[PDB]
Amino acid sequence: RGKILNITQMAAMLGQQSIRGKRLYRGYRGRVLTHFKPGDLGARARGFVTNSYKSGLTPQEYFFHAMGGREGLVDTAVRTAQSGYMQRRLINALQDLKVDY
Amino acid sequence: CAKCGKEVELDLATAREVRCPYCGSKILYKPRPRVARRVKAI
Amino acid sequence: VEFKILEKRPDSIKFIVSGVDVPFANALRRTILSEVPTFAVDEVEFLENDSALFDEIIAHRLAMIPLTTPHERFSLDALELDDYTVTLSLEAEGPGMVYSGDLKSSDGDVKPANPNIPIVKLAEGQRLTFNAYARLGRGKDHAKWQPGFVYYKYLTKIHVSKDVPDWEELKELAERRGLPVEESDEEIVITTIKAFYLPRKFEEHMGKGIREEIVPGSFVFTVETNGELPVEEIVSIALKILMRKSDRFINELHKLA
Amino acid sequence: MRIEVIRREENLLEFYLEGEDHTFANLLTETLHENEHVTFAGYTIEHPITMARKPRFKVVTDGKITPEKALEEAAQKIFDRAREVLEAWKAAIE
Amino acid sequence: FRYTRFEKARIIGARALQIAMGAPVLIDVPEGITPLQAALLEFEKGVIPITVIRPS
Amino acid sequence: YNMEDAVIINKASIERGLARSTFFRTYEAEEKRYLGGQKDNFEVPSPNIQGYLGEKYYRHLDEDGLIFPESKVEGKDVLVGRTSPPRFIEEQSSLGSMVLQGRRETSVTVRPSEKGVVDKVIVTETGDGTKLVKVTVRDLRIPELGDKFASRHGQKGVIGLIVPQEDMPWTESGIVPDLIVNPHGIPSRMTVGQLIEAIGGKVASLTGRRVDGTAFIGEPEEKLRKELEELGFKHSGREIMYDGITGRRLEADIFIGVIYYQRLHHMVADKMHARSRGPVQVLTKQPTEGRAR
Amino acid sequence: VERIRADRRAGKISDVINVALYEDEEVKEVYINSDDGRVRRPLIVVENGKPKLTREHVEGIKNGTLTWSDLIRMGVIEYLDAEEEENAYVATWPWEVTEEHTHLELMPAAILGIPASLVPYPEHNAAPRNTYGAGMAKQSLGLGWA
Amino acid sequence: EPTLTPDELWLVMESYWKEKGFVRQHLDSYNAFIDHGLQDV
Amino acid sequence: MIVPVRCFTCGKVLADKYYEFKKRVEAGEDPGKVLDDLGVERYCCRRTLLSHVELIDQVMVYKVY
Amino acid sequence: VCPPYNADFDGDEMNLHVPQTEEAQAEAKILMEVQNHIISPRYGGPLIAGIQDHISGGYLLTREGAYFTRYEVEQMLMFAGMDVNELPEPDKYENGEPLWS
Ligand SMILES: [Mg+2]
Ligand SMILES: [Zn+2]
Ligand SMILES: [Zn+2]
């Protein structure tokens, strides 16, 4: 139960926070949250958490982290659906084959 | 027998309507008997 | 073997045993928890319960009351315990809180050791009548039959050399908690008769200037009970069980070959 | 306390001791290490749920004394040792 | 002649069923044993008379 | 016995009260009035035929067919005896049902794998004009092997073994741990909040005031560590522990805290069941579903 | 837009009226919302950097003088919809109140809901663990009714 | 001046919950449906 | 649900010092000495006395005959 | 045996059925028993093996300087089924005390 990436993610930066590729764009007409100035593409504004899990996340940063965590939740239940049907195809096509003597 | 909503007992059997003769309400609680039962204490 | 009783309080004792070793003390310690027998309520026969609690909960609490066990009357060191049964009855009625001192016993020698324990609160018109049964039992079968506690620690001495900056604070700290300190022209000797939390300021010198040495063969014990047996007596009864247990083994060995 | 011998061999004895726990077992094992002739002496409690009352001992000597004789002398040590402590105790609380 | 895994399982399975319905057993004494476990000891000694007709 | 999210619980602690809980259920046997004029009549079913259970499953009923309280119920014991009229003396004729022509049983029984004791037997009238009886039965249920425990952070787990109090490692004071948690679960999930709560409960218990932990304006982390030391304890939460089996200090320091757990209701009593050979469907011929069937 | 807002704060017109000015380079629109299902949020108005209605009223809230009905009429608390929030530059703590902030947040710790508020120190965990932990509080066993 | 501190703001918030209900929407909307909305249909 | 008569880890009676605790703390006497002034050494015994709710008074009012 | 089932331990449930006829029962024990499935057909490698504590404990047992005193060695060979005779022998280091690498 290891990864050097999470031990470092407990005493250093978390890093950027992404959603399926692009950075955080989905919000108000010109900004993400209503606590920044309209028209700021800066590092801190567009979703970059600077504090670690030990020192503690601030209110803006904590909300950004939730946007990145819902991604993992949704996906895992969806990927199973396509796999299960797909397996039914190849089983009902190859189950007849045997190796003769 | 019986026992009701915040009062005293009633008589036994039934044929017709079940109402308590004083609070005019109609909900009964069957009273506990007066016997002995062995409950182990683990 | 020689002892040095540090303190004797009502129903507790702390002492320093010397001349034994690590294996034997655990034989002693484990025996006090799991072997020394007391009296406790085994089962309860309810006659009527119009109280605010369920039958099992009240029944459960009756088993938790520590009962005085007279050790000079049967055989507490025997391997086959005596089945002598005592009947604790009670007939109470509300309003008012039911205390532990209201229990009636069928034998004046076995009474609740502590009379101020609340059992259950009774309101108006709620009657409560029961006859608790008490028997002898051991701690390994059920935890209600436990005489008390044993905790032991290594007796260590901490040498704190005077080269360490602000060593005086250790002297001041030790005196606040009551640990015997002997001082000379090189260092201070601290006898750890209780837990010694070192401050963080000194953790960088832990090893260099400050080092801890264990005294081989000296344990500090803490025995405390609840009132069923005198604390002076628990150790006495415990050792006899140990001796008696081992003796049987030799008898079984001859019956093998 | 019944002894069920599992296997007997030349200077080797493994056996079950019904009715015992870690208390008497642990004490008996390290007491055997003072006897210089007993090279190996161990115990274990296979699966403590199904059985935690019968452990399994193994005693190995060097040939000059049987394990059966070795235990009888060894267990005698505990009896004498416990007796001394009890005497000190009683002669203290005065 | 070394058996394949599938042939081994079948032979035991066939042999075990015979042992239930009668069919005298060789030296397989100990103490009370199921019909399955009876076939295992007999096979471990290479005395099973069933031969595999190989399709060739 | 605690690897991969399992938790070991002190035997003594169970046995003195910790996590005990009671389960409740209640049945709703009514009195249907058929349009033809017949009625149900709750009476003790006369030892005859037509649905009669035959054994002494009906021993607990009173004279009027309602149990009286504090009578231990178990297995398929009957709670209330009804008798519904067939209303058609020639409708079924099930190859032996022509001679008896009696009265259909239909008595409400407790579900198969449940036990416990009856508590209250109400009896009243409905909005129309009949008589319905509601009987509730309670169950003791002690926290045994398999019940689920979980903190409020996400450390789900099942009770792994209920080890005797004696063989438990203890701290150079009087403290004996209740729950021994696997150390492979904290730096894997990243629940730093779990460690902070452990220290926070230790300080809170000693001082006596309850630490305030609301998000963003909670008690600053550094104060709990700086107060814990002046109360008389190594700042890091660790202590010297003695292993209860043999008895020698572990050559490390062992962390210890006060964490708030909570017992979840996925209790093993409602999962285990076995099938030997049951009744199946007639027209489709497949076995039945659920614990009630 | 300035007229209606300042009128609402004076208590002359009913409190459920919010006005927002959409600001394109060559389109001007002014919206007035008066429906029945909009989700709003309370915020403290601040003017010239000083948050309006200081400790004088906190002493009276802690006392038995003015309840919350009195506050919204007096003109300190403003219910902002999504639409009005488009022009507001909300601050967080009372320490960063420059002469640009239009409003000021109350206690930010109420962002989350009723079961996720049961977790102590939620800002120190990972996002998936909080979801589990919040979702498990709705299944515990206890006493919820005398 | 000391702006407030967080703690005093908490007292302000506190009043809002005690006076009204946590279940405001189902209760308030039903009260409006009884007077106005009935006669309207 | 009246105070647990034993602690859950350390076997030591505790009901006999609940009530006397509560009324004394509800008058201004700081808890960090009241507990100390009584026989409460280790913290394991202390947690069960500090955090408890004794709902029994509310539930008792309602009846089941 | 808790990579092949892909089970964890937080309440997951498993079912067990018992074959009856003598041919079926025999067939199950020779062809599907666990020991015949240590290597997985997907890739050439072992599937049933050590998990979390099994690996981490193995490191502590074999580091430079893990000297186990005589009492512990004796106690742990009886915990691991193995059954040796009077050959713990011969005590690599006897400087401090006679002990085992
Ligand atoms: Mg699972
Ligand atoms: Zn009435
Ligand atoms: Zn405690």
- Identify the H or E element spanning E38: helix E35-44
Q: Do C50 and B32 touch (CB under 8 A)?
A: yes
**Strand F157-159, strand F6-9: pairing:** parallel
Give the whole-angstrom CA distance, residue G64 versus residue G71: 13
Question: How distant, in Å, are the alpha carbons of B18, J13, J14 from that of F288?
Answer: 41, 20, 19
For F222, other C-beta atoms within 10 Å of its C-beta total: 8
| Nearest-by-CA chain H residue for G36 | H29
Which chains have 3+ CB pairs within 8 A of F? Answer: A, B, C, D, G, I, J
Task: Tokens for I3, please give them.
Answer: 């105070």
- Asked if A72 has any chain F CB less than 8 Å from its own CB, the reply is no
Residue I17 is given by DSSP the state G
Cβ-count burial J13-34 (b if 16+ within 10 Å, e if not): eeeeeeeeebbebbbeebeeee
- Could you give the residue ranges of the DSSP H alpha helices within J1-101? 22-31, 52-61, 70-77
Distance from Cα I22 to the centre of ligand 3, integer Å: 19
Q: Do C163 and C209 contact (CB within 8 A), yes or no?
A: yes
Q: Do C240 and D86 contact (CB within 8 A), yes or no?
A: yes
3 state SS for chain B: CCCCCCCCCCCCCCCCCCCCCCCCCCEEECCCCCCCEEEECC
Query: Among E50, E52, E43, which residue's Cα sits nearest to residue E3?
Result: E52
Instruction: Show Cβ contacts of residue C241 under 8 Å, excluding neighbours closer than 6 positions.
Output: C31, C35, C36, C77
Beta strands in J1-101 (DSSP E): 68-69, 99-100
Give the whole-angstrom CA distance, residue F39 versus residue I29: 69
Q: Give the three-class secondary structure for E55.
A: coil
B1-42 CATH: 2.20.28.30
Give the whole-angstrom CA distance, residue C147 versus residue C34: 9
Q: Rounded to a whole number, what is the distance in angstroms from the first to the last CA of chain J?
A: 31
Torsion sign (Cα): C105, C108, C109, C112: positive
- Asked if G121 has any chain F CB less than 8 Å from its own CB, the reply is yes
Give the whole-angstrom CA distance, residue B13 versus residue F42: 12
Q: Rounded to a whole number, what is the distance in angstroms from the first to the last CA of chain I?
A: 20
Amino acid at the residue C204 = E
Class of residue J84 by CB neighbours under 10 A (exposed 0-12, middle 13-18, buried 19+): exposed
Could you tell me which CATH class the domain I1-65 is placed in?
mainly alpha
Q: Do F50 and F102 contact (CB within 8 A), yes or no?
A: yes
Residue C139 is given by DSSP the state T
Give the whole-angstrom CA distance, residue G20 versus residue C172: 69
- Could you give the residue ranges of the DSSP H alpha helices within chain G? 2-9, 55-62, 68-74, 82-85, 127-136
Beta bridge partners of D13: D8, D59
Query: Among C147, C32, C139, C138, which residue's Cα sits nearest to residue C81?
Result: C138
This PDB structure is determined at a resolution in Å of 4.0
Domains of chain D, earliest start first: 1-94 (3.30.1360.10)
- Could you give the residue ranges of the DSSP H alpha helices within D1-66? 22-32
Q: Prior bond to J90 cis, omega within 30?
A: yes
For C100, other C-beta atoms within 10 Å of its C-beta total: 23
**G115: distance to nearest CA of chain A, Å?**
16
In chain I, what are the domain boundaries?
1-65
Cβ-count burial F224-244 (b if 16+ within 10 Å, e if not): bbebbeeeebbbebebbbbeb
Instruction: Show Cβ contacts of residue C49 under 8 Å, excluding neighbours closer than 6 positions.
Output: B32, C55, C58, C128, C130
Q: Do D55 and C205 contact (CB within 8 A), yes or no?
A: no
Question: How distant, in Å, are the alpha carbons of A63, D27, F149, F259, G134 from that of G119?
Answer: 16, 47, 16, 12, 7
Ligand with an atom nearest the CA of residue B6:
2
**E33: distance to nearest CA of chain J, Å?**
14
Long-range own/partner contacts, residues A66-74 (CB < 8 A, 24 or more apart): A66/G127, A67/A17, A67/A19, A67/A24, A68/A17, A68/A18, A68/A19, A68/G127, A69/G126, A69/G127, A69/G128, A69/G131, A70/G127, A71/A19, A71/A20, A72/G128, A73/G128, A73/G131
Residue D42 is given by DSSP the state E
Q: Do C200 and C40 contact (CB within 8 A), yes or no?
A: no
Q: Do C108 and C65 contact (CB within 8 A), yes or no?
A: no
Cβ-count burial H6-37 (b if 16+ within 10 Å, e if not): bebbeebeebeeeeeeeeeeeeeeeeeeeeee
Ligand with an atom nearest the CA of residue J5:
1
Q: Rounded to an integer, what is the distance from CA C64 to the centroid of its chain?
A: 15
Instruction: Show Cβ contacts of residue I14 under 8 Å, excluding neighbours closer than 6 positions.
Output: I3, I4, I5, I6, I7, I45, I48, I49
Give the whole-angstrom CA distance, residue C176 versus residue G9: 63
Domains of chain C, earliest start first: 1-37+146-154+217-257 (3.30.1360.10), 38-145 (2.170.120.12), 155-216 (3.30.70.3110)
* Side-chain half-sphere exposure of E13, counting CA atoms within 13 A: 17
Instruction: Show Cβ contacts of residue C230 under 8 Å, excluding neighbours closer than 6 positions.
Output: C11
Q: Do C156 and C35 contact (CB within 8 A), yes or no?
A: no
Amino acid at the residue D92 = A
Instruction: Show Cβ contacts of residue I45 under 8 Å, excluding neighbours closer than 6 positions.
Output: I7, I9, I10, I12, I14
Query: Among A65, J66, A34, which residue's Cα sits nearest to residue F215?
Result: A65
B20 is in an annotated binding site: yes
Q: Do D83 and C246 contact (CB within 8 A), yes or no?
A: no
Q: Rounded to a whole number, what is the distance in angstroms from the first to the last CA of chain F?
A: 35
Task: Tokens for A33, please give them.
Answer: 């949250």
**F161: distance to nearest CA of chain C, Å?**
16
For C146, other C-beta atoms within 10 Å of its C-beta total: 28
For F80, other C-beta atoms within 10 Å of its C-beta total: 20
Domains of chain F, earliest start first: 1-20+143-276 (2.40.270.10), 21-142 (2.40.50.150)
One of F56, F134, F271, F285 is an active-site residue; which one?
F134
Q: Is C45 left (phi over 0), alpha (psi -120 to 50) or beta?
A: beta
Give the whole-angstrom CA distance, residue G141 versus residue G120: 19
Measured N-to-C along each axis, helices C22-34 and C231-254 cross at an angle, to the nearest 10 degrees, of 110
Give the whole-angstrom CA distance, residue E32 versus residue C54: 52
One of F266, F271, F273, F285 is an active-site residue; which one?
F266
Q: Do I27 and C19 contact (CB within 8 A), yes or no?
A: no
Give the whole-angstrom CA distance, residue J50 versus residue J42: 19
Which chains have 3+ CB pairs within 8 A of C? Answer: B, D, F, I
* Order of strands, sheet of C149-161, starting from the edge strand that comes earlier in the sequence: C2-9, C12-18, C210-224, C149-161, C187-192, C181-183
Q: Prior bond to C95 cis, omega within 30?
A: yes
Q: Do F33 and F130 contact (CB within 8 A), yes or no?
A: yes
Q: Give the three-class secondary structure for D5.
A: strand
Q: Do I65 and B3 contact (CB within 8 A), yes or no?
A: yes
Domains of chain E, earliest start first: 1-56 (3.90.940.10)
Q: Is F184 a catalytic residue?
A: no
Beta bridge partners of F74: F115
Q: Do A9 and F190 touch (CB under 8 A)?
A: yes
Question: How distant, in Å, are the alpha carbons of A72, A76, A82, A83 from that of A79?
Answer: 11, 6, 6, 7
Amino acid at the residue D42 = G
Residue D35 is given by DSSP the state S
Structure method: cryo-EM
Give the whole-angstrom CA distance, residue F25 versus residue F135: 9
| Nearest-by-CA chain J residue for E6 | J31
Q: Which of F18, F173, F209 has the CB atom closest to I8's CB atom?
A: F18
Give the whole-angstrom CA distance, residue D55 versus residue D18: 7
The helix, strand and coil proportions of chain H, stated in percent and rounded to the nearest 5, come to: 75, 0, 25
Give the whole-angstrom CA distance, residue C98 versus residue A39: 72
Ligand with an atom nearest the CA of residue B7:
2
Residue C145 is given by DSSP the state G
Q: Is F134 a catalytic residue?
A: yes
Give the whole-angstrom CA distance, residue A56 versus residue A72: 22
- Asked if C54 has any chain F CB less than 8 Å from its own CB, the reply is yes
Beta bridge partners of C86: C134
Torsion of CA G115, G117, G118, G123, to 10 degrees: 130
| Nearest-by-CA chain I residue for B31 | I65
Give the DSSP per-residue string, chain F.
--TTTEEEE-HHHHHTTTT---EEEEEEE-----TTS---------SSSSS---SGGGTTB-SSSBBPSS-EEETT-EEE---B--S-SSS---SSHHHH---B---EE--TT-EEEEEEEEEEE-SSS-EEEEEEEEE-----TT-EE--SSS--EEE-----SSSS-EESSS---SEEE-TTSHHHHT-HHHHHHHHHHHHHHHH-SPPP--TTTSPPHHHHHHHHHHTTS-TTSEE-EE-SSS--B-SS-EE-------BBS--GGGT----SS--B-SSS--B--SS--
Q: Do F149 and F263 contact (CB within 8 A), yes or no?
A: yes
Q: Which residues of J touch E (CB under 8 A)?
A: 22-27, 29-31
Give the whole-angstrom CA distance, residue I44 versus residue G98: 50
Amino acid at the residue F66 = L
